[PDB]
Write an enzyme that holds these catalytic residues in place. Sequence first.
Site, short mmCIF file in Angstrom:
data_model
loop_
_atom_site.label_atom_id
_atom_site.label_comp_id
_atom_site.label_asym_id
_atom_site.label_seq_id
_atom_site.Cartn_x
_atom_site.Cartn_y
_atom_site.Cartn_z
N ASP A 35 7.07 -11.83 14.22
CA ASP A 35 7.16 -10.42 13.87
C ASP A 35 7.68 -10.28 12.44
O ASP A 35 8.89 -10.35 12.21
CB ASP A 35 8.09 -9.72 14.84
CG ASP A 35 8.23 -8.26 14.54
OD1 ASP A 35 7.45 -7.74 13.72
OD2 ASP A 35 9.13 -7.62 15.14
N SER A 199 -0.49 -0.24 -1.09
CA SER A 199 -1.93 -0.31 -1.16
C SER A 199 -2.46 0.67 -2.20
O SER A 199 -1.88 1.73 -2.45
CB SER A 199 -2.53 0.00 0.21
OG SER A 199 -3.94 0.09 0.17
#
Length: 330
Positions: A35, A199
Amino acid sequence: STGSATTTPIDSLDDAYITPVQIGTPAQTLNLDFDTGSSDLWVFSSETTASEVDGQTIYTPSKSTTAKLLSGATWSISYGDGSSSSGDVYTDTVSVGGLTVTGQAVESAKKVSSSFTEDSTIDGLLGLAFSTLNTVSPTQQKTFFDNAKASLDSPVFTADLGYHAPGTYNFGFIDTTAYTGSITYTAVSTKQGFWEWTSTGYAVGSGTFKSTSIDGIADTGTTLLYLPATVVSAYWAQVSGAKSSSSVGGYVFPCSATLPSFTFGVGSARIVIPGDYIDFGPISTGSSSCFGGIQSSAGIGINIFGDVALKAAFVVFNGATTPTLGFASK
């Protein structure tokens, strides 16, 4: 040193991926959910409340000759999905894919929330976010990667998750045969303890690319892709009959639909998520309404590039002094 381990979807939807991890001496192999959005290595154990164990493999520290109770140390965690767990802490030897850390903090669960009990395929978590998020008290502990970093050939790990297939986590090296083209690296902020990056934009199907900054985290422990409501609405508008359902808890779509792809930007590069990766199947057994793999982050507080996005790429978690992330197509 290096390590390399195969990671395997837990079910036919790729709801999560499990990777075998050797703990203790002799080894006790548990299948852990790696994770990158958390920083605790915790396991079902001989100390877990019996009624909260239902099929998981347990770590029994009393059978490990290298286990040592970390005196006074406890841990307690709550994840973004509402699940939680807590317990005490041992140090022990932990190996992943041939890479060994001695003295790793292994957090033994005394209590786990129902969602963990109900998932017999996941024996615990191995956190790969920054150690500043580790919950051990009163002395915070380091992640497996933080402990291994100095010994690795290069201070990196890579995630290569499969679509409906096994993939690979590598530690300490880049497998240049595992991706196409080049790896585009992008800046990371560690201020929230995550692999947080920006992004450069998105496209829906064959549509034009929208240049826009989308801050979010690279999180292998989250199944879906959570993005701003404007982006998610633009995606599902291209699927006839798709709608946001308050009762179901997100966007649903007719199971008969063919989904468009979704592209996200990494610098000037583009990662294309095929439409099929966005199908999470019937909302309940036998339903013709299917759950979408792109969902709004509006109620989270952060955008999350979970498995739906990461599985479309070869992802480099570069733990150099100034961390960065790399993405390649594959």
